[PDB]
């Protein structure tokens, strides 16, 4: 290992001693990758061992199995689990690959060359050789593009993926004719992030998702080649700090943004996160409650269209600020929700009064009731319901877990952008250790600020 | 002493022994602090472990009953005992230690021993400061927690009908006390808890800002990337640039400290003043002199059925809290309120 | 230097000779913050009532409409808007924009931009003055909390109507409804936040008292001791060794913190970390995770429920819940 006397970094910053040790840095990164794959495999095995296909996935607190099921792999129409074996196969494969990666990390961390510059020039970066850093970026960018095209191939020629918008309760569909139109695909990124627009979180079709991943894979491969064969422009040299900690800070900012995006994706989106596996969203549960009570009071005579609430605004139906007919009550805040079980009841001007009277099918009612009883509300100790409950139900929605956890991770990695980026700037300038004490900048400035 | 030391007395031997610099300084204040504080903490632990509140609050509040660290609590005695001191030999327990535990006498035991422990701890601060010849500003600062403890655990229950309305020593019990204050006294609207909140938040702000500013204006004083090693306890030069910090905060915020003594006095001053103002407010609540309402707005709302502010909504929330918590929070009242008299919104 | 106007402009913007430091983060902080200040002042003074709950029941929050400073507030945006973007040009008229709570959204957006650029500006001045750039990291904790209570919680709950009102009584209402719907007091992250503010107060008082006591005699009586210190003293005016000895003897020897640097890092890290934790708690509860729910967790041999202090807390929560929005609920479960 190392010591503080020869490095200047204490034990609580010991990995910082690896900044200029290329081989051991590679070993550490490979070991952490092996850790990631090991958690993937072990947690997948844990979930399948604790899984009963009779109950819905979101009832049993599973996060990885919904991810595998969204890709097909043993789900029938309506999100019914047919074979749990593919989940087991995925767990075993990720686990064994993790064993291999862990051995590799151990080797490259203990016995492998400490610095790769001399013996292995192909792997000998210098943290300031801009061409070499761009080459590494290009290699890993090509790998990412290949992964995106792998997803596209899975959806195209390998059984498709689980479309929750398919007629009926949703089913595994083979996506043909992906949305490869530039305007449609790039209109999401420039779309507003507010209500009704939702930025890229509001992607609703599988065709749009597959076309977008097509564009991203192609662009990532092309950009990998470009960043391989080119050196940053002279204006790029002046704009950025060129050090390992600087690159780390840039990546930290990027992945903090991605973590926030994933949190919002899990909370709001129900296309890439079908409610059959992840359970209803917040808006979905609220709309489901309103719909269930509407159909209950409509079955008991009454006329929900003319039913006036206590505020004089409409007990079951009202008009969105734009004019679209929407469910009344507080759920008017979620009027822009769209779900597989409510779209058939929507006409050109929103919810249709005629369809809401006779076109409702029993499966829609059952799904709405189930979503209402499993709203994404829970406690820290996994007690379902609002904060004022009887501590009888054991349920917290997987969407809530994903949203909370990855939001915390996104915030902490933004703090990482701040910390590691400021330190990169200071170290490049030379202030990393403190004021000069012989030539303070402030003492060279005119008084009174 | 002054003119001459006369002869050594047994007090001199006791002082010399007690004032030795051993691992745990006892001192003269120790004879009051160590037994009282030890018994207070041990009583809290025994109560949270074995003692129950089934006969005092009709609540299970011990580990042996199935409560965890959050919900266990040394509950205050029954309201029918009033402000009885609940001595284990008193006319209530009459010597029965088990029944003294059952009656809730452990709460009075812990509260009184804790009060005398706080007195002993401030005495300890005075004694230690006098031994090392320092101005005892930390004892003056510690006067604020003593004021808070006295006003909340002693003055407030004495202003009410009994110890029953004191804070029970526990986590969830303290939370109940807080929500009770919001519901009944409207404690948030009271300007003295406002000043206390401002003091505590400003003290936290000052702590964070001073720490960050010192750690970010350090002089180099070393060649290692670990800036903690580049410091000697006996060095005379300041380890951080006061000029740089002053300039930075002057250009960022507009105003900035230029005097270290004033800065640290301000850091001492803000939380103490906040806590003392909160203590005065709690005394006022002890007398039920609560800043509950703005009469002008209540009158306007009564005359105008469409005038609404966040204050009126808070009043409605307080009303709900009181109505729905009275029945089980105050069992001595025997409030068998039918569900039709409890205030309630629509469809909730 | 360069005769170009752009170079002169960049020199002036980044100049450290300005009384207040403008920066590149400054050129976004100044306009957004000024816009937010203007709108907030004009709305707090004279703004018509706002239909916060979307039930056509406007709430008055301005001084001109019979409010004082304590009750006055800038009412959050209408629940009918939800998370929709509501700029001035979107509304048909200024009257409608005022009615639906547009000023709150305007102030919140321009203010969030302002505080982010304020943190960036703190970093920028640290870089320009040649100091370590981690005051912004400490300042991130208030920014995190403000984002949680103004942006993240509305996003999780699906409406800006659930954002904290820009006022005092509005703040208290937000706190009470939050406790009703999430049991924040039992959440371990508000526990860590409370420990953080109490520790901040404790450590501030402790450190200030120790430094003031250790202040070496450079000024005699008949005047304030502050005259002993000089802004250019460039020396420690307090005996650190005596203060460390006092603190060690007070509780137990070898209590560490003989380093001034270690002491100040601890002072920086305790409240900042705890405020980070409590802001994360607010955001997680915004995604409906709530605190511990030990209601009816203790039962006797036959099955009777034995109440605990958690049950009394639940009774208070029920009291808050059934009254927080009297007319906005048409169905038994809030879920929103």
């Amino acid at each position: 290992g190392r010591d503080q006397e020869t490095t200047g970094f204490a034990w609580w910053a010991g990995n910082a001693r690896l900044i200029n040790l290329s081989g051991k840095l590679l070993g550490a990164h490979v070991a952490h990758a092996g850790l990631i794959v090991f958690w993937a495999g072990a947690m997948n095995l844990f979930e399948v061992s604790h899984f009963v296909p009779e109950k819905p996935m979101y009832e049993q607190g599973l996060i990885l199995l919904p991810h595998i099921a969204t890709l097909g792999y043993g789900v029938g129409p309506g999100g019914e689990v047919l074979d749990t074996f593919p989940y087991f196969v995925s767990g075993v494969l990720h686990l064994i690959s993790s064993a291999v990666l862990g051995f590799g990390g151990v080797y490259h961390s203990l016995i492998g060359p400490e610095t790769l510059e001399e013996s292995y020039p192909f792997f000998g970066y210098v943290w300031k050789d801009k061409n070499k850093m761009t080459n590494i970026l290009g290699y890993h960018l090509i790998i990412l593009g290949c992964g995106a095209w792998l997803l596209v191939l899975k959806a195209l020629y390998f059984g498709g993926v689980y479309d929750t918008w398919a007629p009926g309760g949703g089913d595994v569909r083979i996506i043909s004719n992906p949305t490869t139109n530039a305007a449609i695909i790039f209109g999401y990124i420039v779309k507003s992030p507010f209500g009704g627009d939702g930025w890229i979180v509001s992607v609703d079709n599988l065709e749009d998702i597959i076309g977008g991943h097509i564009w991203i894979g192609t662009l990532c491969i092309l950009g990998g080649i470009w960043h391989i064969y080119t050196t940053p422009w002279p204006w790029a040299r002046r704009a950025f700090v060129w050090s390992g900690e600087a690159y780390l800070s840039y990546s930290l900012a990027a992945v903090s943004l991605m973590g926030f995006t994933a949190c919002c994706f899990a909370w709001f989106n129900n296309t890439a996160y079908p409610s059959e596996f992840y359970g209803p969203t917040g808006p979905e549960a609220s709309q489901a409650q309103a719909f269930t009570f509407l159909v209950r009071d409509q079955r008991l005579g009454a006329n929900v269209a003319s039913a006036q609430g206590p505020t004089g605004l409409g007990k079951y139906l009202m008009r969105s600020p734009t004019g679209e007919i929407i469910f009344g009550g507080e759920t008017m805040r979620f009027w822009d929700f769209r779900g597989p079980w409510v779209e058939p009841l929507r006409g050109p001007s929103g919810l249709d009064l005629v369809k809401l009277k006779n076109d409702i099918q029993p499966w829609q009612e059952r799904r709405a009731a189930e979503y209402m009883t499993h709203a994404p509300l829970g406690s820290l100790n996994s007690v379902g319901g609002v904060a004022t409950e009887i501590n009888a139900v054991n349920f917290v929605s997987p969407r809530s877990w994903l949203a909370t956890s990855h939001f915390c991770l996104g915030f902490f990695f933004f703090v990482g952008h701040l910390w590691h980026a400021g330190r990169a700037r200071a170290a490049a300038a030379g202030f990393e250790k403190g004021i000069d004490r012989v030539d303070e900048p402030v003492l060279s400035m005119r008084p009174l600020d | 002493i002054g003119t001459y030391q006369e002869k050594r007395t047994w007090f001199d031997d006791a002082d010399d022994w007690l004032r030795q610099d051993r691992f745990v300084f006892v001192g003269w204040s120790g004879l009051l602090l160590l037994p009282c504080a030890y018994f207070a903490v041990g009583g809290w632990l025994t109560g949270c472990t074995f003692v129950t509140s089934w006969y005092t609050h009709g609540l299970a509040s011990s580990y042996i009953e199935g409560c965890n660290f959050l919900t266990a609590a040394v509950s205050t005695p029954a309201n029918s005992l009033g402000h009885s001191l609940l001595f284990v030999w008193g006319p209530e327990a009459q010597g029965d230690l088990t029944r003294w535990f059952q009656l809730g006498g452990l709460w009075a035991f812990v509260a009184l021993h804790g009060a005398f422990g706080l007195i002993g701890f401030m005495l300890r601060q005075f004694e230690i400061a006098r031994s090392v010849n320092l101005r005892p500003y930390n004892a003056i600062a510690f006067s604020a927690p003593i004021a808070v403890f006295v006003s909340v655990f002693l003055i407030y229950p004495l202003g009410q009908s009994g110890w029953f309305f004191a804070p029970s020593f526990g986590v969830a019990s303290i939370f109940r006390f807080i929500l009770f204050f919001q519901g009944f006294h409207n404690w948030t609207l009271n300007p003295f808890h406002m000043m206390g909140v401002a003091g505590v938040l400003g003290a936290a702000l000052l702590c964070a800002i001073h720490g960050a500013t010192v750690e970010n204006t350090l002089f180099e004083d070393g060649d290692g990337a670990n800036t903690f090693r580049a410091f000697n306890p006996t060095q005379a030069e300041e380890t951080y640039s006061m000029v740089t910090a002053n300039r930075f905060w002057s250009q960022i915020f507009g105003v900035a400290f230029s005097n270290k003594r004033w800065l640290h006095f301000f850091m001492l001053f803000v939380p103490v003043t906040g806590l003392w103002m909160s203590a005065l407010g709690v005394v006022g609540l002890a007398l039920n002199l609560r800043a509950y309402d703005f009469v002008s707005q209540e009158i306007r709302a009564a005359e105008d059925p469409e005038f609404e502010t966040f204050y009126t909504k808070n009043i409605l929330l307080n009303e709900g809290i009181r109505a729905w918590m009275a029945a089980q929070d105050q069992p001595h009242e025997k409030l068998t309120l039918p569900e039709e008299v409890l205030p309630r919104g629509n469809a909730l | 230097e360069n005769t170009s106007l752009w170079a002169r402009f960049c020199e002036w913007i980044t100049s450290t000779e300005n009384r207040l430091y403008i920066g590149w983060f400054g050129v976004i902080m100044i306009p957004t913050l000024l816009t937010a200040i203007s709108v907030y002042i004009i709305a707090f003074i004279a703004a018509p009532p706002v239909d916060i709950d979307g039930i056509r029941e406007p709430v008055s929050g301005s001084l001109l409409y019979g409010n004082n400073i304590i009750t006055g507030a800038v009412v959050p945006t209408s629940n009918a808007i939800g998370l929709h973007f509501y700029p001035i040009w979107e509304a048909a008229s200024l009257d409608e924009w005022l009615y639906n709570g547009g000023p709150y959204q305007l102030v919140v957006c321009h203010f969030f931009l302002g505080v982010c650029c304020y943190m960036g500006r703190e970093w920028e001045l640290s870089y320009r003055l040649g100091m370590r750039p981690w005051i912004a990291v400490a300042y991130s904790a208030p920014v995190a909390a403000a984002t949680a209570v103004f942006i993240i919680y509305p996003i999780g709950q699906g409406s800006f109507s659930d954002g904290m009102p820009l006022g005092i009584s509005g703040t208290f209402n937000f706190m009470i409804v939050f406790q009703a719907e999430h049991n924040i007091l039992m959440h371990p992250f508000h526990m860590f936040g409370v420990a953080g503010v109490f520790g901040g107060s404790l450590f501030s008082a402790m450190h200030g008292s120790l430094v003031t006591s250790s202040l070496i005699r450079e000024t005699t009586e008949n005047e304030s001791a502050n005259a002993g210190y000089k802004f250019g003293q460039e020396e420690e005016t307090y005996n650190i060794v005596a203060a460390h000895g006092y603190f060690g003897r007070l509780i137990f020897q070898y209590a560490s913190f003989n380093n001034s640097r270690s002491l100040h890092f601890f002072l920086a890290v305790w409240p900042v970390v705890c405020i980070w934790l409590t802001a994360l708690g607010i955001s997680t509860m915004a995604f409906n995770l709530n605190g511990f729910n030990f209601n009816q967790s203790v039962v006797d041999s036959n099955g009777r429920v034995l109440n605990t202090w958690a049950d009394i807390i639940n009774r208070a929560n029920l009291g808050m819940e059934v009254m927080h929005e009297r007319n906005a609920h048409n169905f038994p479960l809030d879920l929103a």
Binding site: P447 | V255, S258 | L63, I69, K230, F231, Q233
Partner: peptide
Amino acid sequence: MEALVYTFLLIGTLGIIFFSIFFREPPRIA
């Protein structure tokens, strides 16, 4: 009339802040 008093108090506080920022006594070094 109460609104007038509140506005005056807020304006006074803001003016005091402005004067304390831009008309402060210079920090005298040594």
